[PDB]
Amino acid sequence: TIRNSEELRGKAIEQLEKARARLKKVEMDADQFRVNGYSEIEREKMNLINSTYKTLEQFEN
Amino acid sequence: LGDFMDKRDASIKEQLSGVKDTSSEVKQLEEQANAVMRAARAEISAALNKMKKETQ
C-alpha cells in the first residue's frame, strides 16, 4: 500500500508537470499565433486597399 | 500503537486524496488550455472579420 500511494504521488506530480508545461507551450502557441494572425490580417487589409485603388486607376484609364 | 495504526493509514489515505486532487487540477489545466487557445483563435477570427467588413 505504501508503494501504491507514493508511486501515485510521483506519477501524478509528473503528470501535472507535463500538463502545466503544455499549458505554457500552448499559451506560447496562442500568443505567437495572436501576433502572427493579427499582423497577417493587417497586411491583407493593405492588400484590399491596394486592389481597390488599382481598380480605381483602371477606371480612370 | 493506535496512533501508528492511524498514522500509516491516514498517510496512505492522504496520498490518495492528494493524487485525486492532482488529477482534478490536471483536468482543469486541460480545460484552461482549451479556453486560452480557442480564446486566441476566436479573438483573431472576430477581429479580422469585423475589421475586414468595416474597412471594406
Curated annotation (Swiss-Prot), chain A:
Q: Which gene encodes it?
A: atpF
Other facts noted in the record for this chain: In plastids the F-type ATPase is also known as CF(1)CF(0).
In which organism is this protein found? Answer: Spinacia oleracea (Spinach)
Q: Which part of the entire protein is covered?
A: 63 to 123 of 184
Where's it found, cell-wise? Plastid, Chloroplast thylakoid membrane
**Family statement drawn from the similarity comment of this UniProt entry:** Belongs to the ATPase B chain family.
Biological function: F(1)F(0) ATP synthase produces ATP from ADP in the presence of a proton or sodium gradient. F-type ATPases consist of two structural domains, F(1) containing the extramembraneous catalytic core and F(0) containing the membrane proton channel, linked together by a central stalk and a peripheral stalk. During catalysis, ATP synthesis in the catalytic domain of F(1) is coupled via a rotary mechanism of the central stalk subunits to proton translocation. Component of the F(0) channel, it forms part of the peripheral stalk, linking F(1) to F(0).
What is annotated about its quaternary structure and interactions? F-type ATPases have 2 components, F(1) - the catalytic core - and F(0) - the membrane proton channel. F(1) has five subunits: alpha(3), beta(3), gamma(1), delta(1), epsilon(1). F(0) has four main subunits: a(1), b(1), b'(1) and c(10-14). The alpha and beta chains form an alternating ring which encloses part of the gamma chain. F(1) is attached to F(0) by a central stalk formed by the gamma and epsilon chains, while a peripheral stalk is formed by the delta, b and b' chains.
What is the designated name of this protein?
ATP synthase subunit b, chloroplastic
From Swiss-Prot, chain B:
Q: What is its main location?
A: plastid
Q: Which GO terms describe its biological process?
A: proton motive force-driven ATP synthesis
Keywords of the record: ATP-binding, CF(0), Chloroplast, Hydrogen ion transport, Ion transport, Membrane, Nucleotide-binding, Plastid, Thylakoid, Transit peptide, Transmembrane, Transmembrane helix, Transport
Tell me where it resides.
Plastid, Chloroplast thylakoid membrane
Query: A GO CC term?
Result: proton-transporting ATP synthase complex
Task: Summarize the subunit comment.
Answer: F-type ATPases have 2 components, F(1) - the catalytic core - and F(0) - the membrane proton channel. F(1) has five subunits: alpha(3), beta(3), gamma(1), delta(1), epsilon(1). F(0) has four main subunits: a(1), b(1), b'(1) and c(10-14). The alpha and beta chains form an alternating ring which encloses part of the gamma chain. F(1) is attached to F(0) by a central stalk formed by the gamma and epsilon chains, while a peripheral stalk is formed by the delta, b and b' chains.
Q: What else is known?
A: In plastids the F-type ATPase is also known as CF(1)CF(0).
Q: Which family does it belong to?
A: Belongs to the ATPase B chain family.
Q: What does this protein do?
A: F(1)F(0) ATP synthase produces ATP from ADP in the presence of a proton or sodium gradient. F-type ATPases consist of two structural domains, F(1) containing the extramembraneous catalytic core and F(0) containing the membrane proton channel, linked together by a central stalk and a peripheral stalk. During catalysis, ATP synthesis in the catalytic domain of F(1) is coupled via a rotary mechanism of the central stalk subunits to proton translocation. Component of the F(0) channel, it forms part of the peripheral stalk, linking F(1) to F(0). The b'-subunit is a diverged and duplicated form of b found in plants and photosynthetic bacteria.
Name by which UniProt lists this protein:
ATP synthase subunit b', chloroplastic
Please tell me the species this chain comes from.
Spinacia oleracea
Q: Which residues of the complete protein appear here?
A: 112 to 167 of 222
